[PDB]
Amino acid sequence: DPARLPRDTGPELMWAPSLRNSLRVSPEALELAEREAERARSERWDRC
Amino acid sequence: MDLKVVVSLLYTDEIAKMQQRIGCILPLASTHGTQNVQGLGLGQVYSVPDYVSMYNYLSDCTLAVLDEVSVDSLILTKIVPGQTYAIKNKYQPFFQWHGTGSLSVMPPVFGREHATVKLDIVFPMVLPTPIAEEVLQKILLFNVYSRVVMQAPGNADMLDVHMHLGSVSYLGHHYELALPEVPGPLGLALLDNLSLYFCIMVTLLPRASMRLVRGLIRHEHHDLLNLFQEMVPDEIARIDLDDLSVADDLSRMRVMMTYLQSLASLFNLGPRLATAAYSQETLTATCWLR
Amino acid sequence: MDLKVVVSLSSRLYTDEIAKMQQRIGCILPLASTHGTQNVQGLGLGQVYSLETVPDYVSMYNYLSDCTLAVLDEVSVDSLILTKIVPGQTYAIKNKYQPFFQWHGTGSLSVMPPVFGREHATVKLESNDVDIVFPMVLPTPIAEEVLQKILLFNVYSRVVVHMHLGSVSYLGHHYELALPEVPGPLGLALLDNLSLYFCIMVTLLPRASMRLVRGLIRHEHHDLLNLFQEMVPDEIARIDLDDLSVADDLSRMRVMMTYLQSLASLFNLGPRLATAAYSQETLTATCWLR
Numbered sequence: 073d074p075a076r077l078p079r080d081t082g083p084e085l086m087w088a089p090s091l092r093n094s095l096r097v098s099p100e101a102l103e104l105a106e107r108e109a110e111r112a113r114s115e116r117w118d119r120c
Numbered sequence: 121m122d123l124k125v126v127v128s129l130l131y132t133d134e135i136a137k138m139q140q141r142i143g144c145i146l147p148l149a150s151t152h153g154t155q156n157v158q159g160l161g162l163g164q165v166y167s168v169p170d171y172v173s174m175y176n177y178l179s180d181c182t183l184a185v186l187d188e189v190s191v192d193s194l195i196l197t198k199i200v201p202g203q204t205y206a207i208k209n210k211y212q213p214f215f216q217w218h219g220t221g222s223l224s225v226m227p228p229v230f231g232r233e234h235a236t237v238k239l240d241i242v243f244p245m246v247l248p249t250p251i252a253e254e255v256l257q258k259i260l261l262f263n264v265y266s267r268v269v270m271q272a273p274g275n276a277d278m279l280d281v282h283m284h285l286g287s288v289s290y291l292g293h294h295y296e297l298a299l300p301e302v303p304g305p306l307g308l309a310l311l312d313n314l315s316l317y318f319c320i321m322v323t324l325l326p327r328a329s330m331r332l333v334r335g336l337i338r339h340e341h342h343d344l345l346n347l348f349q350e351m352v353p354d355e356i357a358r359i360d361l362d363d364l365s366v367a368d369d370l371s372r373m374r375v376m377m378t379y380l381q382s383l384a385s386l387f388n389l390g391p392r393l394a395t396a397a398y399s400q401e402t403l404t405a406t407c408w409l410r
Numbered sequence: 411m412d413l414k415v416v417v418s419l420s421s422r423l424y425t426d427e428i429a430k431m432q433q434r435i436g437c438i439l440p441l442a443s444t445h446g447t448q449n450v451q452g453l454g455l456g457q458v459y460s461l462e463t464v465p466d467y468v469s470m471y472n473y474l475s476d477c478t479l480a481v482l483d484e485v486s487v488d489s490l491i492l493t494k495i496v497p498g499q500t501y502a503i504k505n506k507y508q509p510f511f512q513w514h515g516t517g518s519l520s521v522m523p524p525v526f527g528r529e530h531a532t533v534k535l536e537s538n539d540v541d542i543v544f545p546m547v548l549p550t551p552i553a554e555e556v557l558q559k560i561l562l563f564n565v566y567s568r569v570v571v572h573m574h575l576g577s578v579s580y581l582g583h584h585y586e587l588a589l590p591e592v593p594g595p596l597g598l599a600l601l602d603n604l605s606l607y608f609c610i611m612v613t614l615l616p617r618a619s620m621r622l623v624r625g626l627i628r629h630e631h632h633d634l635l636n637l638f639q640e641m642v643p644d645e646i647a648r649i650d651l652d653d654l655s656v657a658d659d660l661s662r663m664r665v666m667m668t669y670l671q672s673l674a675s676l677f678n679l680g681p682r683l684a685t686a687a688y689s690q691e692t693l694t695a696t697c698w699l700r
Contacts, residue, residue, distance in 0.1 A: 073351040075344060075347065075348040075351070076344065076347060077341075077344040077348075078341055078344070150687070151686070151687070180516055180517075181516065182686070201698075202498075253667050254664075256667065257660065257663040257664065257667055258660070260663070261616075261618065261656070261659055261660065261663060264618055264619050264622045265618060265654075265656070267622055267626070268618065268621060268622050268625070268654065271622075271625045271626075271629065272621075272625060275621055275654045276618075276654045276656075280656055281656055283656075284656045284657060284660060285656070306630065313634075315619075315622075316632070316634050317634070318619055319619045319620070319622050319623040319626065320623070320634055320635070322615050322616065322619045322620065322623075323619075323620060323623050323638075323643065323646065325608065325611050325612050325615055326612055326643070326645045327643070328608055329605070329608040329609050329611065329612045331565070332565060332601070332604065332605045332608055333605055333609065335565040335566070335567075335568050335569070335601075336565070336598070336601050336602065336605050338568055339598050342595045342598040342599060342602060343599070343602045345602065345606060346602055346605050346606070346609075349606060349609045349610065350609070352609065352610070352613050353609055353612050353613050354613075356645070356648055356649065357612050357645055357649075360643075360644055360645050361643075361644060366566065366569055366570055366571055367571055367574070368637075368639070370562065370566060370571060370574070370575060371637060372637055373562055374558065374559070374562060374575075375637055377558040377561075377562070378554070378555070378558065380670075380673070381554050381558070381674065381677060383670065384670040384671065384673050384674035385674050387667050387670045387671060387674075388671050388674060
């Protein structure tokens with residue numbers, strides 16, 4: 073059972089939301105890296 | 121200032137009975153010099169017994185310790201929130217007092233015949249706050265559990281509600297109670313209406329809480345906590361109606377808010393009297409109004 | 411002790427404001443500081459309740475509780491004498507509030523932000539180009555009725571009946587009160603704390619009392635029950651399936667009675683006045699600050 077919230081900053085007790093407790097994810101760059109690495113894997117499929 | 125109040129009116133056994141309680145307190149009618157018999161404590165309200173009116177009357181008028189009893193007068197001093205006093209635990213339900221414990225005054229739920237003097241004068245009970253709130257809870261659940269087994273014998277048992285309701289506990293002091301085992305239905309008992317308020321507020325609390333959460337959650341984020349504490353209730357009380365006549369819903373909400381506030385002002389025990397240093401060898405305690 | 415505060419006006423005063431203000435003698439006014447002399451700014455709630463169209467009642471309550479209180483008796487040109495109110499002192503408070511509230515005997519007064527319109531309790535002081543509003547004082551049951559009517563309007567904003575909520579009723583007269591549409595995030599924060607308390611109530615609410623009240627509405631009918639219109643609610647159907655046990659009922663009440671004291675004390679916003687000996691022929695009473 074989770075909860076939903078906008079923002080906070082700079083804690084000391086650990087299980088409190090913050091700006092440093094956010095994973096820093098860029099979706100478009102990860103999709104781009106994922107797609108180009110799928111094509112590198114698909115070339116690696118047909119090598120030996 | 122001047123603090124004495126001389127009230128006018130007894131005989132030898134009345135002298136001894138009033139002399140037994142020369143350290144107890146009781147309310148008055150007015151802060152004047154001379155008064156009559158009828159203006160003394162709890163006489164005109166307790167003779168049908170009903171708790172909430174008596175608590176309102178006890179918070180209404182002021183209070184007074186009595187000092188001396190003559191043949192035709194009772195010398196007594198009213199208490200003012202300025203300075204301090206010295207009162208006694210001279211009540212037949214003996215609850216042992218302790219140091220720096222806040223003392224309460226509740227209207228007498230322990231029967232008329234214990235805390236009285238038959239001439240009339242009815243003294244209120246004085247007893248500390250955790251014992252006060254615990255005896256309030258253990259008389260209220262006793263009321264509703266007696267009404268349930270008077271209604272349905274298969275929902276609870278009588279000895280099931282005497283293994284856990286006939287006794288209060290505070291710092292090892294395991295007292296007993298005088299519980300009214302035969303209240304009689306349709307009201308007519310003491311604490312008959314407070315349970316009747318408690319059940320209505322505990323019935324209207326789902327219709328209040330769901331309407332409040334659904335009305336507060338549309339204002340998007342002042343705070344996360346109104347939806348953060350949406351998981352801690354059960355989902356049975358979550359999906360209840362979400363639709364009613366808003367005339368009926370508003371009337372139910374207004375009645376539940378009024379009865380909730382009156383009940384919450386009553387669960388706060390009333391006039392809280394604070395001790396400083398109790399002495400059991402002397403049965404006296406420094407006390408002042410708070 | 412000498413409690414006199416004189417407020418110096420920065421300019422003169424026209425004769426109509428003199429005639430209006432000398433009618434407003436004896437009312438409770440708030441002050442900015444507690445020092446010797448002050449200017450006209452910082453007096454009254456007009457600094458936080460400006461000449462605008464959207465009020466904010468709870469921030470007005472905050473400004474009332476945070477600052478000190480005084481009473482205005484002597485008013486002339488360029489100068490008007492105030493008398494402070496400090497805990498430990500007693501005062502006389504006259505009843506010069508034009509919504510004429512009949513005061514109960516020895517009840518308790520409560521100050522109030524002006525709910526009956528800005529123009530009702532306001533003196534326009536164009537000479538010092540500012541405005542002084544006069545905070546309403548009215549008894550505590552009417553106070554709680556106005557406050558819960560305000561919050562129920564704030565929560566039933568998003569639903570729709572209007573005249574049956576935004577108009578109080580008294581034995582003396584029924585009145586109308588000014589209603590905003592949003593009280594801002596502080597009113598939403600009051601609703602936040604109220605819903606916090608309420609959702610933890612409906613987590614920890616006892617289940618013996620529901621099993622009482624189901625059979626009680628199906629057995630009895632009262633003014634305390636006819637608001638249900640002789641219909642059981644749905645959560646009474648989907649909650650009373652469980653058995654009835656004493657121990658968890660006591661453990662529920664042992665936290666319920668703790669929480670309801672906090673829920674009462676959250677409605678203690680605005681300074682309270684427990685007065686004594688009100689007379690219906692002098693229109694004043696001996697009061698002090700609780």
